[PDB]
Amino acid sequence: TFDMNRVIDEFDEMTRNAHQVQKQTLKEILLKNQSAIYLQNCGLNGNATDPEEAFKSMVPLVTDVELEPYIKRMVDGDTSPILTGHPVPAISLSSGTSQGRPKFIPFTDELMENTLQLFRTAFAFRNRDFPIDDNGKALQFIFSSKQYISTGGVPVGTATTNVYRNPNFKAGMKSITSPSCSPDEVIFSPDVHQALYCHLLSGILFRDQVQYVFAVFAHGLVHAFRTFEQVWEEIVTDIKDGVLSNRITVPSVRTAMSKLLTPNPELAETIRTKCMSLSNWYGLIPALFPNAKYVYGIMTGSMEPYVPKLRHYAGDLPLVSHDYGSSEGWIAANVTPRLSPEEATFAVIPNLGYFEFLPVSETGEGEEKPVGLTQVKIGEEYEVVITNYAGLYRYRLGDVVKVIGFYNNTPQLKFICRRNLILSINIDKNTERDLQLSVESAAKRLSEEKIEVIDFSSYIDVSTDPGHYAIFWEISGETNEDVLQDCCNCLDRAFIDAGYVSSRKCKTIGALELRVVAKGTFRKIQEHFLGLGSSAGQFKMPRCVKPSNAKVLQILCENVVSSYFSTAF
Amino acid sequence: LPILLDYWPSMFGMRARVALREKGVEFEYREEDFSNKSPLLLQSNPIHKKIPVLVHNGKPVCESLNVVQYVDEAWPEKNPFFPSDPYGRAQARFWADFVDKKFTDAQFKVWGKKGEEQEAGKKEFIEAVKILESELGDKPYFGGDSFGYVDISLITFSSWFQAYEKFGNFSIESESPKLIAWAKRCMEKESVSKSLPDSEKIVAYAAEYRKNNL
Amino acid sequence: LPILLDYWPSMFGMRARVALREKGVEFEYREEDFSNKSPLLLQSNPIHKKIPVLVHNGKPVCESLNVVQYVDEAWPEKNPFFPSDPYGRAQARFWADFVDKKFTDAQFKVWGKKGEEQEAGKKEFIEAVKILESELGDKPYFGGDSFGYVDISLITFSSWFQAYEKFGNFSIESESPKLIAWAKRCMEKESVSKSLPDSEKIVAYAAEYRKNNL
Numbered sequence: 001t002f003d004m005n006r007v008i009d010e011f012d013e014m015t016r017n018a019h020q021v022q023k024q025t026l027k028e029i030l031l032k033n034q035s036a037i038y039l040q041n042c043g044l045n046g047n048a049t050d051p052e053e054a055f056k057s058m059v060p061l062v063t064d065v066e067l068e069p070y071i072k073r074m075v076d077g078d079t080s081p082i083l084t085g086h087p088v089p090a091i092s093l094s095s096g097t098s099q100g101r102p103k104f105i106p107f108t109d110e111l112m113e114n115t116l117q118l119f120r121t122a123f124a125f126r127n128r129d130f131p132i133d134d135n136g137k138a139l140q141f142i143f144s145s146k147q148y149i150s151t152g153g154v155p156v157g158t159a160t161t162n163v164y165r166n167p168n169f170k171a172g173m174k175s176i177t178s179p180s181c182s183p184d185e186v187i188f189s190p191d192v193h194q195a196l197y198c199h200l201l202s203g204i205l206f207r208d209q210v211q212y213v214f215a216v217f218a219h220g221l222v223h224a225f226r227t228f229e230q231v232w233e234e235i236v237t238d239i240k241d242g243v244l245s246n247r248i249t250v251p252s253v254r255t256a257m258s259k260l261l262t263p264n265p266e267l268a269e270t271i272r273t274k275c276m277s278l279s280n281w282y283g284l285i286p287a288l289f290p291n292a293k294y295v296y297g298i299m300t301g302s303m304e305p306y307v308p309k310l311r312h313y314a315g316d317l318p319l320v321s322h323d324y325g326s327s328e329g330w331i332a333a334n335v336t337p338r339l340s341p342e343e344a345t346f347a348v349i350p351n352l353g354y355f356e357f358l359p360v361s362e363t364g365e366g367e368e369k370p371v372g373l374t375q376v377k378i379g380e381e382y383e384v385v386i387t388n389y390a391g392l393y394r395y396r397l398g399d400v401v402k403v404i405g406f407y408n409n410t411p412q413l414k415f416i417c418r419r420n421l422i423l424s425i426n427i428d429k430n431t432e433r434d435l436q437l438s439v440e441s442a443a444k445r446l447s448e449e450k451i452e453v454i455d456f457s458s459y460i461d462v463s464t465d466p467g468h469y470a471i472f473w474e475i476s477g478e479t480n481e482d483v484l485q486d487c488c489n490c491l492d493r494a495f496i497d498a499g500y501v502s503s504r505k506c507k508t509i510g511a512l513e514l515r516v517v518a519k520g521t522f523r524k525i526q527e528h529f530l531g532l533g534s535s536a537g538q539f540k541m542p543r544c545v546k547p548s549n550a551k552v553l554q555i556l557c558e559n560v561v562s563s564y565f566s567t568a569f
Numbered sequence: 570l571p572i573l574l575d576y577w578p579s580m581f582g583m584r585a586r587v588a589l590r591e592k593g594v595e596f597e598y599r600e601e602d603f604s605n606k607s608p609l610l611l612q613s614n615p616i617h618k619k620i621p622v623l624v625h626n627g628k629p630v631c632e633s634l635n636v637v638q639y640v641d642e643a644w645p646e647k648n649p650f651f652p653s654d655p656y657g658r659a660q661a662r663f664w665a666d667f668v669d670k671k672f673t674d675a676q677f678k679v680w681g682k683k684g685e686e687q688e689a690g691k692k693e694f695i696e697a698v699k700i701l702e703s704e705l706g707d708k709p710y711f712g713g714d715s716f717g718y719v720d721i722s723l724i725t726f727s728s729w730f731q732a733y734e735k736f737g738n739f740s741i742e743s744e745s746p747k748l749i750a751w752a753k754r755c756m757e758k759e760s761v762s763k764s765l766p767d768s769e770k771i772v773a774y775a776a777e778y779r780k781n782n783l
Numbered sequence: 784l785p786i787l788l789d790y791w792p793s794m795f796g797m798r799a800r801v802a803l804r805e806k807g808v809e810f811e812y813r814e815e816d817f818s819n820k821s822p823l824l825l826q827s828n829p830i831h832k833k834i835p836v837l838v839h840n841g842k843p844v845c846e847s848l849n850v851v852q853y854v855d856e857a858w859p860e861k862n863p864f865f866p867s868d869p870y871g872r873a874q875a876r877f878w879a880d881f882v883d884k885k886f887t888d889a890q891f892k893v894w895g896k897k898g899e900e901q902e903a904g905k906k907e908f909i910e911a912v913k914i915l916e917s918e919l920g921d922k923p924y925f926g927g928d929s930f931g932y933v934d935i936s937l938i939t940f941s942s943w944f945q946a947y948e949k950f951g952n953f954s955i956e957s958e959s960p961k962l963i964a965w966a967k968r969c970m971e972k973e974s975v976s977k978s979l980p981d982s983e984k985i986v987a988y989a990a991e992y993r994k995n996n997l
């Protein structure tokens with residue numbers, strides 16, 4: 001049950017208690033995890049009296065590559081548990097790459113608990129700074145329309161999509177948000193770009209009740225509001241006659257939207273008139289929602305260049321930066337959300353993981369040993385290392401954060417980061433230039449409709465006979481299938497190597513499959529990841545999925561706005 | 570050789586079979602005829618007359634949890650079922666009492682009855698499977714860093730999972746894949762890959778046990 | 784300091800108490816009103832909500848027999864209840880498991896129920912008390928050459944022996960004397976001589992239980 005005062009004073013005691021609950025976090029994780037095969041090899045067994053000293057001296061630091069094989073074991077039919085434990089409800093991917101290749105990380109229901117409280121505690125902290133009406137709503141560009149099942153019959157999961165499709169989500173979040181604008185099915189509409197258009201429509205549908213405008217990322221809102229900028233003359237026509245644009249085709253979301261539509265001429269007069277009293281949609285969001293108290297999302301790191309466009313979109317309505325963490329674990333929470341985005345620092349919540357920090361103090365990099373949370377040094381930058389409920393045990397995630405100060409006894413973290421960049425020789429390529437080229441080649445078939453490609457990814461499915469390549473597209477607008485088919489063919493045609501040719505011509509790798517996904521999917525891959533708890537060095541999108549990437553994997557199958565196999569070949 | 574007198578469809582006996590096989594001990598198996606009790610089982614345990622009992626050095630060890638720990642302590646040199654710390658083996662025992670008691674009455678009744686009870690224990694089975702699911706946090710096993718004490722206790726319940734899949738008409742995997750697939754990991758090991766009988770056979774035992782008493 | 788969450792007529796609570804005092808711990812008892820199960824008890828075992836519970840290092844330790852092995856492993860330098868061999872260990876656990884099944888339920892029947900239920904439970908405890916007497920044979924105790932594991936397990940039932948004698952309107956000594964015999968022998972240990980409350984009161988609790996459910 002959400003309650004401002006008791007939850008934050010418990011959070012206050014919590015942050016005062018940084019040491020024990022950090023210790024306890026580790027304690028319970030390993031108590032819950034005494035069986036991990038990683039750990040026998042580490043020489044661990046629990047209890048005793050040197051438990052902190054033990055692990056810091058006994059288990060070695062690890063990388064994504066070494067993390068690949070074991071959770072691969074979980075995912076691929078051998079329904080079998082590993083470095084933490086049990087066959088988890090969901091497994092991860094990570095931006096940047098594991099030597100150019102995909103990285104898996106498990107999800108258990110504890111991770112959901114990590115989330116509810118963080119949103120529980122932070123919403124209360126924001127409601128302390130921006131108090132909301134308990135009868136209103138929010139425009140939340142939130143998406144979870146999509147859920148794939150691994151080749152072993154196991155759920156493979158995204159952070160966000162495992163949030164909203166979870167059995168405990170709706171009842172769990174009832175008390176800590178203003179009621180969603182979207183019917184359940186459009187958030188989960190198999191066409192999320194149309195859902196986007198509907199979500200625009202959705203948060204717009206209770207404007208006077210809207211208490212804030214939300215996307216996890218500014219680029220999310222920026223793209224939403226640059227897409228706002230793309231489609232709402234279509235919306236006026238759509239909501240005018242009580243009949244939705246021909247752009248919308250998926251039956252369940254069309255059914256849901258048909259349940260709300262009746263003809264309404266006066267508001268078109270209305271809608272055209274306000275909206276350009278601004279010059280060029282500066283302060284488009286308080287214009288849209290005049291009762292919105294804030295814009296909520298990341299405003300630090302690599303999103304700092306999207307902050308201006310958003311503040312350009314936002315005008316002078318105060319901009320609040322949102323907290324940091326992921327499936328890989330939660331790290332920091334904004335308990336003072338009223339502060340400006342450039343100065344934004346977030347406080348760590350301590351039982352969501354047990355995390356250590358590698359100092360950068362020497363030159364770059366430097367052979368210093370990892371130090372604990374309260375012994376870290378203010379003003380200096382450390383790399384985050386993570387042990388949590390998500391299958392990471394003292395894992396080097398690879399990004400750098402600065403310590404700005406303390407909220408009582410727990411430290412404040414700032415993120416001037418961007419990319420976890422250094423890479424190495426992959427196998428899910430098909431040279432990056434070739435796959436980018438492939439997208440570029442086939443997409444100008446769509447550019448004929450005045451469309452560009454905002455993003456793209458790919459995947460290899462080797463459960464099928466023969467296995468096939470799966471390419472995924474995020475494009476600026478709805479079009480027909482015939483051209484998406486032509487694109488799939490071109491994408492095959494744009495993989496120019498002599499190798500690729502022997503394969504697919506001799507069908508020893510089956511016809512490649514283009515499933516065009518819808519908008520926001522790669523908004524969502526960014527969105528869970530600068531948000532990821534560590535440091536904003538988290539931005540290089542993995543571009544093709546070896547059976548070892550998952551967030552996008554849970555983002556592949558169900559939001560097939562269309563899915564097709566090359567009629568050529 | 571130590572000889573196991575046992576009962577081919579008994580999870581409890583399989584615990585003992587799993588223990589000995591987990592180790593590396595050469596042992597002799599004995600099939601028991603409950604209508605025609607052997608003189609050796611009768612002379613080992615003339616009271617309950619119950620399996621499994623291991624006679625080693627000419628001395629019988631009865632009851633499943635008691636056998637597996639006898640297996641551990643009589644030969645404590647390579648793959649230990651217990652951890653080194655008292656509170657650790659504690660949890661293994663606490664959950665061993667859990668598996669053999671409330672979890673067992675829940676399943677016994679899932680494969681053993683019709684009508685009200687069966688449904689009442691549809692709930693009880695799921696909720697107990699739920700709490701193990703909770704306790705495990707995320708452990709690839711139960712009682713220690715490898716194959717362990719309560720893993721031993723429950724792995725033999727995993728042969729009966731298909732019997733609980735049908736008469737309980739469940740999917741204990743679609744509600745909690747964590748546990749069965751914990752066993753499917755545990756299944757790759759030969760202690761259960763050579764001691765656990767066919768599951769089509771376990772589904773058969775209970776089905777025919779359902780025909781003979783109403 | 785060890786916190787034992789106990790219940791005055793708990794044979795099992797007494798199992799914990801007897802065990803601890805036998806070893807050599809100074810510990811604190813808290814009387815529980817199971818109408819209002821404690822914040823620390825409800826945190827120790829949120830589902831069973833059952834005692835005895837010994838909290839050490841801030842780790843709740845539950846189930847009576849489970850608790851007395853905790854006693855062994857927690858202070859393993861002075862008074863062991865087990866012998867040195869694995870088989871002797873398993874014998875003792877075997878007979879502790881005996882104490883807990885048909886024995887417990889039988890007495891449960893003799894002072895808890897009446898009529899058709901009663902005499903069944905009456906022949907039952909006489910039979911249990913005879914296998915008992917038979918296996919006691921000669922030993923001053925059970926689980927070893929001195930005060931043992933299951934010594935603790937079954938000695939605590941001996942204050943109820945009065946309760947069993949009057950409601951049963953029996954005399955469990957003429958059919959089997961060497962046990963109650965053995966029992967007041969074991970009373971001379973300060974472990975049980977200060978942990979177990981008066982039997983006229985235990986009788987009276989059985990009478991309160993009886994007057995309530997007729």
Ligand SMILES: Nc1ncnc2c1ncn2[C@@H]1O[C@H](COP(=O)(O)OP(=O)(O)OP(=O)(O)O)[C@@H](O)[C@H]1O
Pocket residue numbers: 089090091092093094105106107108111112113115156157158159160162163325326327328329390527528529531532550551552
């Ligand atoms: N940053 C985040 N954004 C959205 N959801 C998050 C985030 N961090 C954790 N979660 C939560 O993770 C839990 C589920 O996400 P989840 O962990 O399933 O995906 P996963 O399989 O671990 O791997 P991944 O998210 O990296 O794909 C949910 O309770 C979800 O709320």
Ligand SMILES: N[C@@H](CCC(=O)N[C@@H](CS)C(=O)NCC(=O)O)C(=O)O
Pocket residue numbers: 576579580581582603618619620621631632633634
């Ligand atoms: N605690 C004992 C009890 C065993 C028990 O009841 N076993 C069944 C087979 S699983 C049995 O032997 N029953 C004898 C009978 O039906 O009379 C154990 O698990 O070994």
Ligand SMILES: N[C@@H](CCC(=O)N[C@@H](CS)C(=O)NCC(=O)O)C(=O)O
Pocket residue numbers: 790793795796817831832833834835845846847848
């Ligand atoms: N065999 C168990 C059972 C113990 C037992 O009978 N506990 C009762 C003592 S009356 C109890 O705690 N009851 C609590 C309740 O009635 O809710 C043990 O030894 O711990």
Ligand SMILES: CC/C=C\C[C@H]1C(=O)CC[C@@H]1CC(=O)O
Pocket residue numbers: 114115116118119163216322323324325326527528529530531532533
């Ligand atoms: C507790 C978070 C639940 C959902 C998380 C996502 C949101 O809805 C806001 C962003 C957040 C991701 C992040 O902070 O990394």
